[PDB]
Amino acid sequence: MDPSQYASSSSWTSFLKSIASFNGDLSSLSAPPFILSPISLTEFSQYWAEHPELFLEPSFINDDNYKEHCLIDPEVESPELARMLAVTKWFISTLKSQYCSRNESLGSEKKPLNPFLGELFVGKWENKEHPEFGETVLLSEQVSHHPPVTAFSIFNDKNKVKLQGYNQIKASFTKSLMLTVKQFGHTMLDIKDESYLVTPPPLHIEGILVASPFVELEGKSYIQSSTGLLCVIEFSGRGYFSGKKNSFKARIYKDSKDSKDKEKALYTISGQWSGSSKIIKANKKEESRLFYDAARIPAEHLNVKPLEEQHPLESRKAWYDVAGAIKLGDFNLIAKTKTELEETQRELRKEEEAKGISWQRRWFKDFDYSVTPEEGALVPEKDDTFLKLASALNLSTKNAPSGTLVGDKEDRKEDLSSIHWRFQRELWDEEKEIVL
Numbered sequence: 001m002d003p004s005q006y007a008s009s010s011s012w013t014s015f016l017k018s019i020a021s022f023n024g025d026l027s028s029l030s031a032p033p034f035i036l037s038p039i040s041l042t043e044f045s046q047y048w049a050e051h052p053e054l055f056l057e058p059s060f061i062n063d064d065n066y067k068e069h070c071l072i073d074p075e076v077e078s079p080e081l082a083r084m085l086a087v088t089k090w091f092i093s094t095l096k097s098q099y100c101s102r103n104e105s106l107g108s109e110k111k112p113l114n115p116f117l118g119e120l121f122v123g124k125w126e127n128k129e130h131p132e133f134g135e136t137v138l139l140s141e142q143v144s145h146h147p148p149v150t151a152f153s154i155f156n157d158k159n160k161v162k163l164q165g166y167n168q169i170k171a172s173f174t175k176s177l178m179l180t181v182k183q184f185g186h187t188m189l190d191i192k193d194e195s196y197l198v199t200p201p202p203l204h205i206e207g208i209l210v211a212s213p214f215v216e217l218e219g220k221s222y223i224q225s226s227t228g229l230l231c232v233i234e235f236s237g238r239g240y241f242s243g244k245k246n247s248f249k250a251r252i253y254k255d256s257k258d259s260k261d262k263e264k265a266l267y268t269i270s271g272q273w274s275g276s277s278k279i280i281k282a283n284k285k286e287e288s289r290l291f292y293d294a295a296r297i298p299a300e301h302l303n304v305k306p307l308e309e310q311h312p313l314e315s316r317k318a319w320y321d322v323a324g325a326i327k328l329g330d331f332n333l334i335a336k337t338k339t340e341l342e343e344t345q346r347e348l349r350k351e352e353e354a355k356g357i358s359w360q361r362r363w364f365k366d367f368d369y370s371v372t373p374e375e376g377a378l379v380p381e382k383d384d385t386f387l388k389l390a391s392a393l394n395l396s397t398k399n400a401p402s403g404t405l406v407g408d409k410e411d412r413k414e415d416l417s418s419i420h421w422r423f424q425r426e427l428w429d430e431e432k433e434i435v436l
């Protein structure tokens with residue numbers, strides 16, 4: 001049907017009625033074919049680096065050239081600050097990819113494919129037009145199905161820029177049918193020997209009643225550097241804190257302590273992350289400059305090998321039949337193909353249980369950060385980067401919502417684990433089957 005027919009359709013009405021009985025698992029809802037996306041969540045990891053030049057920029061800034069690598073402030077105080085400004089610009093640049101890509105390619109936000117345990121998605125940004133850049137690799141793996149958890153790493157060996165992280169969510173519907181989403185997990189970016197800890201923001205899905213879903217961000221995100229510098233990004237939409245949707249205000253401080261006083265902000269950035277934003281240095285409001293305009297720089301999609309040469313665990317290869325059925329809009333075929341894949345997985349889980357076998361993750365391992373870890377689990381190292389960055393930001397190391405600070409209600413929750421997924425580069429180095 002035409003999108004103008006979605007909202008009043010029998011299918012959508014049935015879907016909305018099933019929300020009143022939501023059990024916490026989004027996959028239990030009856031999503032009509034018109035609201036389905038043929039893209040799996042394991043693919044979302046690619047949204048962290050669709051602007052290759054911004055991802056790598058920090059690695060080109062040093063003590064001898066930093067003032068030439070800060071467009072909005074050729075008088076920037078230090079290379080550490082120039083790099084924080086670059087990391088902040090990169091982070092803001094990821095937002096349109098992360099949260100607006102389906103609206104552009106599908107017409108609205110839609111239900112992504114729920115990845116199967118073990119699902120992989122790999123590719124690379126060859127950066128052919130920039131030999132100094134080198135190849136940037138993406139590795140994404142579904143490390144959990146119950147609940148869904150995606151782990152990923154994006155790395156550029158040539159310039160020593162590496163990123164790793166994981167993601168999972170908890171969702172709930174309000175009585176007004178707003179889908180509230182809390183993200184869990186964090187991402188770490190290493191620029192040579194300098195590190196940055198990034199926490200994703202909470203969000204909500206609007207437009208459910210009218211069958212035209214879209215994401216709006218809320219809350220805050222943090223970017224804590226090993227240099228002590230901290231960027232605090234606050235999100236809002238429509239009105240109340242801004243005159244337009246997809247808005248934000250970011251402030252960079254010398255350290256976490258200073259972030260307690262907005263007046264101590266070294267720079268203040270404001271605007272729309274899906275559009276343009278300006279930056280002000282100190283309190284010189286009369287001298288604002290353009291910081292980033294998402295509309296001027298088209299996203300660069302990574303190179304993925306043809307389906308013909310993909311391993312059975314690779315996302316597009318595995319979901320091929322379902323994706324085809326979704327594109328055809330065939331109700332019965334979508335049900336048939338999806339059930340075939342998911343039933344096969346259920347059978348595997350039951351077999352492993354009967355034989356006393358467990359599923360082994362491929363390139364990531366869960367590290368128990370709790371004081372009393374499981375006797376067989378892996379434990380963090382001495383100079384763990386996450387621990388030092390979390391300490392500097394006074395961030396909870398428990399499995400609380402992303403960005404939870406020590407002492408917050410979520411951090412004071414009883415019997416809360418502290419297990420975090422970490423990339424094991426050695427496992428990729430010794431990979432014997434998967435290629436790019």
Ligand SMILES: C[C@H](CCCC(C)(C)O)[C@H]1CC[C@H]2[C@@H]3CC=C4C[C@@H](O)CC[C@]4(C)[C@H]3CC[C@]12C
Nearest residue numbers: 026029031035044098099109110111112167181
């Ligand atoms: C599961 C729901 C859709 C449910 C639709 C329904 C209720 C009709 O089935 C989707 C919609 C928006 C999706 C998020 C979009 C962006 C991101 C950022 C990425 O880095 C991690 C995944 C995440 C949080 C998506 C999760 C799934 C979401 C909420």
